[PDB]
Structures are given as structure tokens and as C-alpha cells.
Amino acid sequence: GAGVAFGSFDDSFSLASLRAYLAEFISTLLFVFAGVGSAIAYAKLTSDAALDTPGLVAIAVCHGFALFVAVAIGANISGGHVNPAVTFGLAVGGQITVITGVFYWIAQLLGSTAACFLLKYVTGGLAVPTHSVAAGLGSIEGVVMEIIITFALVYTVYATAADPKKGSLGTIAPLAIGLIVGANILAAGPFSGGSMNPARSFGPAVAAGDFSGHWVYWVGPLIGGGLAGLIYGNVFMG
Amino acid sequence: GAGVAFGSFDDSFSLASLRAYLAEFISTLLFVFAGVGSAIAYAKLTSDAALDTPGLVAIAVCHGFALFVAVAIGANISGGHVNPAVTFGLAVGGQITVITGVFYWIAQLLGSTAACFLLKYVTGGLAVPTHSVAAGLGSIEGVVMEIIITFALVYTVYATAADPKKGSLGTIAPLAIGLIVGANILAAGPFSGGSMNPARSFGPAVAAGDFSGHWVYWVGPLIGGGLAGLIYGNVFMG
Amino acid sequence: GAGVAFGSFDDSFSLASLRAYLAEFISTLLFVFAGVGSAIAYAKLTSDAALDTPGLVAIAVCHGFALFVAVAIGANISGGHVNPAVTFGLAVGGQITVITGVFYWIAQLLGSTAACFLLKYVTGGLAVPTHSVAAGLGSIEGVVMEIIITFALVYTVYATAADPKKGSLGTIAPLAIGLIVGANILAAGPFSGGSMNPARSFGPAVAAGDFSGHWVYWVGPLIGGGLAGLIYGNVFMG
Amino acid sequence: GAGVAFGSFDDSFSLASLRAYLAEFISTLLFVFAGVGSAIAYAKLTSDAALDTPGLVAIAVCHGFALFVAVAIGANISGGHVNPAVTFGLAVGGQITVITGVFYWIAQLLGSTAACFLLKYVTGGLAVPTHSVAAGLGSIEGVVMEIIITFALVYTVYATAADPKKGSLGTIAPLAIGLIVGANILAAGPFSGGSMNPARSFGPAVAAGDFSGHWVYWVGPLIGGGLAGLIYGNVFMG
């Protein structure tokens, strides 16, 4: 399989790269605004009740639909990563350079953070919820959950969008990528929160001023995404 | 990026333009009939309860599915705007002429209004609900919410349907456009109502004889749509 | 626009036509089995409660997904009508011959009826629910509801599947056709039941031995479907 | 129609075949992890309540989305069967060799079982639920339910993915295949559980150490899948 490529500053500062960074910022902002917004909407409707099944459905569907769109609207400009773990898994398989990937991370983190401060305002100052592992459940269980579900996501990105042999999968790729996240929130929501996405988790941690447990949402997703890049890149593109 | 184009009467009165106006009328009627209808259905089932999470899901899914369809069924005739803010954002980027755009607005407003009078009849005279900003929440918060979510919609229309480089996105564009509205209602419903669409809001205001607060659903969506046209048109098509 | 074509017996008894009839039987059986089945599932889970919002969502989503599939799996064999009103609207615009269309009706009615007797068995003898206009609501209101929502469906079939200029819409047509039915059930369920489909309504009327009010689900859908054929066929294909 | 083909060891041990087996393992693992996971999520949220309508929706949507993805991500490597009954129905119509098909079964069963042991861990040791026929309902009713719904699935796979004349259906095939399972769970969940898939059922039986009634989920799905292969393969591909 293709090796890691560090890239160059010239390449990573080209106008095409700059457009890509803006696209990643915008896609991540819009994804996180909707997705976090659905969780705040549930809190508003229920006066801050514990999550129930209708709420889980609302939040999962919102994230799946919004991520489909966020990926689609960047696909021809940046590739529509919307997610540091996607960028990382792609970098592991030589699909994006390291330098460009770092700038994608910055754009994604900025976009997510912006979305969360916008939410705080437009909702009239409601709390921005953070991802956390369920009460009582171990952190390793949470990490392993996040490894598995993020592996699923990044593997999907490889199979439908990166693979040169994708064929007609390329047309439906944004939808597959969004709806694997939706599906996986329906499973993982009550356990890890169903992040799959360090930026999605980071914005709220900034806006709520609370990084307790936040490491889970870097370690788990990066390992899952990296494992997907290693497996798909070496076996199915190698 | 392309400038605003005023157009001509000859062009805007051509048979092709007249077909486009009828298509916009029909698509907007069917979109608003379903979407408002889902809100009246919730009121019927619950005896006019406050919105809850099942209801929000029902209404969001209905709007997302219905808008997907309404866009698809006009895509090859009018472009499937279904929305004055989409038309406006496209006009800002030179994608539709101003004169033609004004006639699209008329067709959309007429279609929405018609849908709402039809609903009043077929439901046995139930109230046609109007979009309003949540009790206690400021109007600027509501406007800014609508700016953000309408920006998302119009940006999606640009990226998937207008951009000449859309490629395979063009096939899934109607679905992206519908499901961003669905996603954004799941976030915004309990705050602004999740309009994104001055015509969707206007029909009910006419049918309920209540324009209180209605300005929000012109100012917010037009600004969001205009900002999407400015950004995408000048950066990603320029 | 194209006129009505009566067709011929030779044509309507060809092997291609016979395959089409079997495909319509199978698609309609599978559509109605799922869709009615979701309503029986709700009754089982709730001990025959009145419809609530979760139930409406379940039933609407089931029908939208199932109809998408039923249309897709016949699209290249029969055209995937799955619905006497679709067949009728297509016949009005010269898209299927009258003789072939009558045999499609028979196949659809048989498939729906079969599904409903299968359901009665596999559910352990539970009642097969019938479409009815809501208590107190007038029959004309119910008919007009069904006209509007069936117009939407058949117009969608024309715009995405019949029109020679459909282009990329043809790829997503089955999904548009399914999800307009889903959307429209979210609106119409508590009022007319959201049929759009004389066969979908007829199977249960046979299996429950109850044709009270059943005429609504022929008059409303046939008029809507016929109006869609007249408008689209003469304006947008003429 | 094409006959059954036994195949060869050389063919079934080729690198292409080995890649296919890994893809089937991964797709089935990810499908079952999400889908079973959604059922465990419901149990967590509700403290092990009986299934209700929100829960049925959550579980059906999760399975439909996850299966769409699992099929898509194997489509160009293995064909994306994810299901012994799909493999069997395809084998009946000569679309996969018997030897290769047996190895697909092994990969699918292993993947499902792995998913279920992973779930047991990451959820903090919660019970892995098994498919069972509803209390009081006969086993033949359960089998016949599973025949019908699995026929639907495998017929969909033939019509959209196997048929050489699939045309544009091939692009949307993964989505049709996923959403027929979603639809059919909305009908069958409270009666048979809505399996359609011997591997999906088998993983939990292993992880819960409970094979009571499990035969239903081999007999019903294999017969349905085999009947779909016989009908579609001989009539619509013959």
C-alpha cells in the first residue's frame, strides 16, 4: 500500500489547498451546528431530561443527514473529511499529505468550535453538551467502542470514496459516510456518546469549558481511523 | 465570480420560463402541503400539545423527504428552488436573472399559500401553524439561527447543483438539499421553527392571518442565502 | 402530449408483458406486506392503541422505504408502478397501454390481497387494518386530501421516471417515489390514512371484509393520478 | 436460468477470494455491531423495558442504515452479501460458487460472533439480545414471516445488484438492500424479530449461550432466499 507522505509547504499553501481548508471549516461548522444543535433541541423540549429513545433517534438522524451533506458539499473541493480521524486515516494510507492534513485538523477544530459558540448564542445561552462515557462505564470500554465505530466510518470513506475502483460507489459515498455515523450513534450514544470525530467532541469541550474525559475522543477515533487506513490501504488498495 | 444579471422580459416570458414558474408553483405547493401538514397531523394526534421529540422528528423527516422530492421534480424544468432564499442566493451569484427570480418568488409564494388553504379545508378546519421564535428567545437570536441554517441550505444547492464541477454530486443533489433541511429542523425547530424558506413561512402567515414576527423569516433566510451565494460564487466558482 | 393508447392483446400477452405482471404482483405484495405489517406491529406493541406520533413515524418510514424498494425491483421489468393510480396516470399520458394497464391493476390488487392474507396468518390472526377517513371528517375532505397527495406521487413518477429528459433523476427516481409517499403519510395519516394507492387500500378491505368508505381510496387517488398525467404529459412532456 | 456451480478450491483460495472473505467478515461485523448495539442501547436507556414503538424505529433505522453501508463497503470486493441467506440465494441462481459461498458463510458467522463479543465488552457486560418468535406465536408463523421478508431482501439483491440489466439500479442497490431490511423490521420486529439473516441471529445465540428457537432463523431465511433465487434467476434472468 501507499506510504505516508509528508508533503510540502508549497503544495499545502497553494490556492487549491487554501480552498480546501475553507471548505473543511465550513463543512465542519455546519455539521457540528446541526448535530450539537439537535442535542440542545432535545434538552429544550424536555427541560434537560436524560436521553430517551426518541431523543437518540432525533440526534442520530440529525447527525447522519448533516454529515451526508457536509461531506457532499466538500467532496470536490477538499474531499469532505469533516473529521480529524478521517483525515488521519487517509494520511496513514497516503491519501492526503501530513502537512495538508494538519491544516485540515485546524480548519475542522476551528469550524466545530465556531459552531458551538454560535449555538450558545442562538439558543439563548443554553449549555452546550459534551460527549462523555456513560456513568459507571470504564474508559477503556469507551475507547474500544470509539475504535470500532470510527474504524467503520473511516473504512467506509476508503471503500466508497478513496478506492480508485469505487465505481458507482463514488456517487453514493457521501450518503454511506453520513449514514454509518447515524447508525453508529443509535448503538453507541448511550455508552460513549457516539463521537467518531475528535473535532465534533472538541468544540463542545471548548464551549462548555470542560475537558474531563475528552482524551477518549482522540485516542479511540484516531486508533480506529488509523487501523482502517492500515487495513484498507494495504489489503484492498494493496 | 459571476455578477448579478438583471435579465430581460423576453427571456423571462419565454415558454421555458413559463414552464419554470409552473414547476416552482407545483413543487412549492407540494412541499408546503406535506410539511405544514405534518405539523397539523401532530396537533391532531395530540390534541394540540406542545411540540415533543417524536413530533419534531416527524416534522423534520417529513420536510426533508418532501423537499428532496420537490427539488427533484423541478430540477430539469426550473432548477427546483422551492424557496425564495435559494432563488435569491442563486441570483446573487449570477445563476438566475433577477427578473426570472422575481417571478419564481411569486410562484413560490402562491404555491405555499395555496397549500395552506388546501390544508385548512382537508383537515376539517384545523389551525394552520405559523413559524415563530420560541417564547422568551430574542428576535436577533432567531434571525441569526435562520442565517446559519439557510446559509447551509443555499451553500448545499451551490455545491451540489450549481457548481459546473459538481460531477456525481449532481445525481444526489436533490437528496442533499432535502436532508440538510431535515437535519436543520432537528436543531432549530424549538428555537426559530427551522424555516430556511420565506415562502414556507409566508403561506401559513396568510392562512392564519398572523404576520407577527414574520419578518424574521425574510431577513434571516435572505441574509443566509445571500452570504452563501457571495462566498461560494466568488471562492469556489471563482 | 401523447394520447391514450388502447394497445393490443398480442402486445399485452407477450412474454415481456407477462414478466411485467409478475413483477407488479411481487412488488405490490412486498410493499403492502411491509406497510400494512408496520401498522399491525404498532397494534401489537401498544395493545391496539389509537395512533400516536411514534406510530405514525414508524408506519410512514416503513411505507417510504418499502415503496422505494418495490419500485426499484420492478423498474427494469414492469416500470415499478405498484399502484393502480400510478398505472392510471401513466395511461392518461400514453405511457402504458390501457390493456396492459388493466392487467397491471389485476396484478397489483392480487398482490396486495395476498400480502394481507399472509399477514393475517403470520401475525397469529391479528386484525388487518383498513384505511378510513378520520372520525367526524367529511368524505369530500378525505377525497380531496387523497387527490392532492396522489397527484404528488404520480407527478413525481412522471418527472423522475417517465420524462425522456429525466437525466440523472432516473437514478434516484425510485427513492423519490418512495419518499414522497413517506412524507405524505406523515401529513395525511391522521386524516385520510395517507393511501395514494387503491391496491394498498383494497387488500385490507378484502382481508377485513369491510368496504365501508373504501370508494374514497379509488376516487381520490384516480383523480389525483389522472390530473398529474394530464398536467405533466401535456405541459412538461408537451 | 444459470445452474448451481460447485466451483473449485483453486478459485476459492485465490487472493481475490481471500480478499472477499475478509470483506465479508468486516462488513458483517460492522453491521451486526451497529444493529445489535441499537437493541442494547434501547435496553440501557429504558432499563430493559419491553420493546416499544420508538425502540422499534431506532432498531429498524439502525439496521437499514448499517446494512446499506455494510453492503456498499463490500460491493466491489466480495459483492457485499453480509448474510448467509443472500449468499445461498445467489448460489441457487449460479451467481456465486458453492465452495466460495461456504467460505462466505464462515466469514459472516465469524464476523457476527466477533461483533457480539465486542458488544458484551464495550457495553459493560450487558446481555446480548437474541431473536425469538413473540410469546405465544407459533413457530411456523415465525418461519413463514422470515420466508417472506427474506425473499424480499434476496429478490432485491437480484433485481438491483445481480441482474446484468440492472442499469442505474446498480448505483442505488446498496441503499435498496439496506432499506428493505429496515422496512421489514418495522413490520416483523414484534413477531419474529425481523432477522432475514442467519448470521445476524447466530452471533447473539453464541454470545448469549442460547440456541432455543434459533432454527427458525436458518429455515425461514434460507427458504426465502432460495425461493428468490429460483424465481428471479429463472424468470427475470431466464
Author numbering:
A (entry chain A), B (entry chain A), C (entry chain A), D (entry chain A): 1 to 238
Lines quoted from the article behind this entry:
Aquaporins are integral membrane proteins that form channels that accelerate the passive permeation of small polar uncharged molecules, like water and ammonia, across lipid membranes of the cell. Tonoplast Intrinsic Proteins (TIPs) belonging to the Major Intrinsic Protein family, also known as the aquaporin (AQP) superfamily, have been shown to conduct both water and ammonia. Crystal structures have established that AQPs are homotetramers, where each of the monomers holds a functional pore created by six membrane-spanning helices (helix 1‒helix 6), five connecting loops (loop A‒loop E), and two shorter helices (helix B and helix E), both displaying the AQP-signature motif Asn-Pro-Ala (NPA). Substrate specificity is thought to be achieved by the aromatic/arginine selectivity filter, which has been defined as four residues located at the noncytosolic end of the pore.
